[PDB]
Amino acid sequence: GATAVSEWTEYKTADGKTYYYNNRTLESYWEKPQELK
């Protein structure tokens, strides 16, 4: 990756949980994708 930093959006919950929602693949990852680094 190391580019296209726009398809990976960070959603922060009030209780302090971070998950990245990727619309490209419709996949939700609770840990940072290697595309982000």
Swiss-Prot record:
<protein>
    <recommendedName>
        <fullName>Transcription elongation regulator 1</fullName>
    </recommendedName>
</protein>
<feature type="domain" description="WW 2">
    <location>
        <begin position="2"/>
        <end position="35"/>
    </location>
</feature>
<comment type="subunit">
    <text>Binds formin. Interacts (via the second WW domain) with TREX1 (via proline-rich region). Binds RNA polymerase II, HD and SF1.</text>
</comment>
<comment type="function">
    <text>Transcription factor that binds RNA polymerase II and inhibits the elongation of transcripts from target promoters. Regulates transcription elongation in a TATA box-dependent manner. Necessary for TAT-dependent activation of the human immunodeficiency virus type 1 (HIV-1) promoter.</text>
</comment>
